[PDB]
Write an enzyme that holds these catalytic residues in place. Structure first.
Site, PDB file in Angstrom:
ATOM      1  N   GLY A   9       4.856 -18.522  13.605  1.00  0.00           N
ATOM      2  CA  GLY A   9       5.825 -17.867  12.746  1.00  0.00           C
ATOM      3  C   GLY A   9       6.573 -16.631  13.377  1.00  0.00           C
ATOM      4  O   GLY A   9       6.219 -16.390  14.352  1.00  0.00           O
ATOM      5  N   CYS A  10       7.470 -16.232  12.873  1.00  0.00           N
ATOM      6  CA  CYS A  10       8.343 -15.084  13.401  1.00  0.00           C
ATOM      7  C   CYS A  10       7.412 -13.763  13.595  1.00  0.00           C
ATOM      8  O   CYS A  10       6.977 -13.403  12.431  1.00  0.00           O
ATOM      9  CB  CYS A  10       9.671 -14.867  12.640  1.00  0.00           C
ATOM     10  SG  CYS A  10      10.938 -15.862  13.044  1.00  0.00           S
ATOM     11  N   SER A  11       7.499 -13.088  14.773  1.00  0.00           N
ATOM     12  CA  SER A  11       7.054 -11.953  14.932  1.00  0.00           C
ATOM     13  C   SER A  11       5.556 -11.768  14.430  1.00  0.00           C
ATOM     14  O   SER A  11       5.078 -10.834  13.754  1.00  0.00           O
ATOM     15  CB  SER A  11       7.844 -10.803  14.532  1.00  0.00           C
ATOM     16  OG  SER A  11       8.943 -10.687  15.255  1.00  0.00           O
TER      17      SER A  11
END
Lengths: 478, 4
Positions: free
Chosen positions: A375-377
């Protein structure tokens, strides 16, 4: 120096010998990159590199990195917005990919320069080294004035670590120059004085290179078996944002991160042995009984399409995996998975922190799960690129998770799925050929290779990092 | 592609 040896005894001498530990930190000034290389049964090596020895200091490098990251993040989140316009969006990302590639090249070239060999995973060979020492000391006698001070083997290993000098087209001239200055400075530091202009550096480079060719010719004739060598990075608070693993010199090599030596030591002592050899050094997680969380927010339809049938066929059905698809996991379910599943797969937005509180990951008796946060960051660096005690990953590490895979910045679903599919095949969670027999790389090795699967090595794959120790899948274990 |  006294303190360091206490560290060697109480921490490093417990680390598997085929692994070495490198810590990276900055001088109080910010002017120097401080590098410490640690390995069980080896003398500690301490390196202090002034970034400006040759327009590009650390502040400047970090600033450029963060701006690039800002623009990358901006590109993931536009993705939808641009409706023709599709061509321009792609052009923007490829260009950022090129910018980040260039930045890492400049970092390796300028900051590390001829010292890049400190990251070398080459096997130490005392008999060959004594030959190189003899030839190199000969070089010194022949070309210096003050024509007594003897160099530590670790310094000579820096020369060796530049790479195979016998490779067609190999050119180590700047690097060798850089390292010869180092040697002159050490001698100088230890009471053997020499004016720079009175040394024929250009001749020394030539003779030293020939000496390295002699070394590697011998080394190549008799190569040691595969070490399954791993590097584990300890990074200062502000250095986690750098994708070290994607530097040219670490690219494709098995590299993970650890928040501290205390972490490292705890994880090693918690290792599960295989039900059944360098592989026995890693933590072993059974394939049976894992959990996957796939498209928890339901909008990642492309992602669900990619993995649903595979996970059903290969995980849920034959290996008793828990399946959570297109619904949020409740927090007790998430916690229960962490306690009981050897592997937890999270294929959703962000870190999953929307589904499980940080404070509750700390209440866990033990985090059994090796955790993949796709997932993002999901590494949850600060806006300023710092690794803080409050992110999900730090919490997993404190709870005792053997490893955690996450991302340093934002990434698209399609390209991170490419990476993720790569990890799972290489790690042996899925059979070979799935995405288009079962493999068995360590998690760290599988991550390093899987970067190859992305369309963007830097914009996407360089974001991917692993915190923890090498984990192997134990297919028949329980 | 969609931002995750």
């Amino acid at each position: 120096t006294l303190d360091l040896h206490r560290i060697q005894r109480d921490y490093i001498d417990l680390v598997p010998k085929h692994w070495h530990v490198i810590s990276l930190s900055l001088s109080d000034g910010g002017h120097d990159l401080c590098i410490t290389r640690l390995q069980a049964g080896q003398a500690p090596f301490v390196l202090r590199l002034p970034l400006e020895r040759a327009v590009f200091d650390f502040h400047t490098g970090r600033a450029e990195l963060l701006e690039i990251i800002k623009e990358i993040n901006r590109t993931c989140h536009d993705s939808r917005d641009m409706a023709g316009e599709r061509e321009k969006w792609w052009a923007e990302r490829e260009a950022l990919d090129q910018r980040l590639k260039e930045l890492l090249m400049n970092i390796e070239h300028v900051w590390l320069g001829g010292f890049r060999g400190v990251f070398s995973q080459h096997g130490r060979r005392p008999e060959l080294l004594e030959k190189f020492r003899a030839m190199f000391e000969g070089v010194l006698d022949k070309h210096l004035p003050s024509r007594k001070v003897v160099l530590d083997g670790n310094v000579l290993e820096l020369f060796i670590g530049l790479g195979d000098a016998t490779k067609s087209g190999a050119d180590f001239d700047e690097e060798l120059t850089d390292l010869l200055y180092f040697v002159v400075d050490i001698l100088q530091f230890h009471g053997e004085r020499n004016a720079y202009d009175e040394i024929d550096f250009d001749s020394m480079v030539v003779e030293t290179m020939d000496a390295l060719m002699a070394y590697h010719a011998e080394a190549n004739a008799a190569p040691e078996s595969d070490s399954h060598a791993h590097t584990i990075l300890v990074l200062d608070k502000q250095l986690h944002v750098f994708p070290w693993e994607s530097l040219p010199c670490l690219q494709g090599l098995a590299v993970s991160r650890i928040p501290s030596l205390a972490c490292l030591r705890k994880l090693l002592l918690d290792r599960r042995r295989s039900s059944s050899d360098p592989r026995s050094a890693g933590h072993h997680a059974p394939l049976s009984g894992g959990t996957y969380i796939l498209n928890p927010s339901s909008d990642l339809l492309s992602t669900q399409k990619t993995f649903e049938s595979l996970f059903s066929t290969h995980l849920h059905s034959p290996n008793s995996w828990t399946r959570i698809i297109s619904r949020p996991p409740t927090e007790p379910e998430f916690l229960s998975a962490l306690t009981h599943s050897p592997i937890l797969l999270y294929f959703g937005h962000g870190s999953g922190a929307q589904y499980i509180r940080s404070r509750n990951i700390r209440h866990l008796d033990h985090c059994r799960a090796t955790v993949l946060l796709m997932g993002c960051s999901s590494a949850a660096l600060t806006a300023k690129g710092e690794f803080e005690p409050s992110g999900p990953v730090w919490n997993y590490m404190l709870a005792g998770a053997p490893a955690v895979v996450g991302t340093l910045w934002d990434v698209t679903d399609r390209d991170i799925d490419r990476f993720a599919g790569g990890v799972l095949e290489g790690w042996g969670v899925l059979p070979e050929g799935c995405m288009g027999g079962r493999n068995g790389l360590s998690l760290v090795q599988a991550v390093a290779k899987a970067r190859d699967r992305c369309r963007f090595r830097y914009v996407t794959a360089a974001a991917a990092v692993v915190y923890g120790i090498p984990v192997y899948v134990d297919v028949d274990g329980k | 592609e969609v931002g995750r």
